[PDB]
């Protein structure tokens, strides 16, 4: 207790994110922070706009293969807002039925697979890349202001994931 205990939590995480030594452990930590609360399932999305290759996206998740196949098979990346920087009008996204009011075949399938609500972030960097994270939760309960201690920590997790993973990946 010294008016700075939240700064010290940030300092502790900054040290841990540097000690990862890999992009894999950087993202794995932020997803383990969801699993530690027994939420449901976790997800990362990453994109490398390389000039030497055709442009590509990578993504990681503990989701059921029936959702992961169905999402890929119909190419739900075309209709999902969690990868579209224009929807992040204050740098952040929240799941309500209103947000999914066009993405109804995303929400109905996600609801069935156990992704009963979720939480989402984005960042932009002058060094390049782009990246996103989202936690799902089996608690079908409302998103208000998310919860202040989660809403700030989410902006921290997206910053440090994008920062640590960018400085490891360079693309
Ligand atoms: C192939 C899976 C990619 C993982 C990245 C998240 C994609 C996803 O499942 N999004 C849905 C899940 C329910 O709400 C959404 O916006």
């Amino acid at each position: 207790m010294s008016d700075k205990d939240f700064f010290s939590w940030r300092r502790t995480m900054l040290l841990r994110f540097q000690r990862m030594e890999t992009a894999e452990e950087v993202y794995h930590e932020i997803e383990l922070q969801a699993q530690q609360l027994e939420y449901d399932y976790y997800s990362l999305c990453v994109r490398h706009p390389v000039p030497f290759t055709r442009p590509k996206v990578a993504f990681y998740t503990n989701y059921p293969e029936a959702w992961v196949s169905y999402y890929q098979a119909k190419n739900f990346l075309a209709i999902d807002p969690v990868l579209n920087p224009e929807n992040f009008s204050q740098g952040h996204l929240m799941w309500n039925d209103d947000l999914f009011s066009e993405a109804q075949p995303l929400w109905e399938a996600a609801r069935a697979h156990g992704l009963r609500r979720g939480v989402t972030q984005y960042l932009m960097l002058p060094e390049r890349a782009l990246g996103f994270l989202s936690f799902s939760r089996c608690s079908a309960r409302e998103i208000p202001i998310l919860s202040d201690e989660l809403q700030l920590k989410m902006q921290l997790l997206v910053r440090e994931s994008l920062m640590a993973l960018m400085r490891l990946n360079d693309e």
Side-chain angles (χ1 to χ4, degrees):
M1 296 76 178
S2 284
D3 328 301
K4 294 160 198 62
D5 299 80
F6 32 78
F7 158 82
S8 192
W9 186 294
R10 206 187 75 235
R11 186 181 174 159
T12 300
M13 233 55 53
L14 262 160
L15 188 290
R16 289 179 75 240
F17 279 119
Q18 201 170 111
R19 289 284 78 255
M20 298 305 178
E21 228 87 81
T22 69
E24 311 189 276
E25 211 173 282
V26 165
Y27 103 85
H28 186 216
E29 170 57 32
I30 90 199
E31 309 281 60
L32 283 170
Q33 206 258 245
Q35 296 263 245
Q36 265 289 180
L37 307 179
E38 300 187 90
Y39 259 31
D40 174 58
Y41 297 126
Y42 64 66
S43 67
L44 190 86
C45 187
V46 182
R47 53 183 288 130
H48 28 233
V50 194
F52 287 84
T53 204
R54 275 46 164 83
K56 284 292 181 181
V57 183
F59 44 67
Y60 311 121
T61 177
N62 198 14
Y63 288 155
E65 76 187 273
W67 176 237
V68 175
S69 194
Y70 177 64
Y71 186 97
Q72 280 186 92
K74 313 306 191 187
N75 283 267
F76 275 92
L77 290 95
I79 77 101
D80 183 345
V82 308
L83 60 72
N84 182 358
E86 290 179 10
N87 208 131
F88 298 81
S89 288
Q90 292 290 271
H92 171 68
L93 253 282
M94 290 180 138
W95 300 17
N96 281 322
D97 303 78
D98 299 272
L99 200 302
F100 290 73
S101 187
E102 193 177 301
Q104 299 180 34
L106 199 76
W107 179 206
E108 186 74 327
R111 174 192 177 213
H113 289 98
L115 296 66
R116 297 213 275 270
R117 290 321 243 215
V119 320
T120 307
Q121 309 97 290
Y122 152 71
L123 213 81
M124 218 294 110
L125 298 91
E127 293 81 2
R128 204 176 306 287
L130 220 62
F132 311 85
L133 82 85
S134 87
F135 317 143
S136 295
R137 69 182 192 202
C138 67
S139 23
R141 271 45 173 155
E142 190 191 89
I143 293 284
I145 204 292
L146 237 169
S147 284
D148 47 88
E149 158 70 356
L150 179 56
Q151 91 95 137
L152 293 172
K153 198 95 88 297
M154 277 177 66
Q155 194 184 84
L156 178 279
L157 269 320
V158 80
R159 174 236 287 274
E160 310 259 273
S161 178
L162 276 271
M163 175 171 58
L165 199 145
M166 173 86 282
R167 222 163 100 188
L168 210 291
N169 193 77
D170 292 332
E171 297 176 330

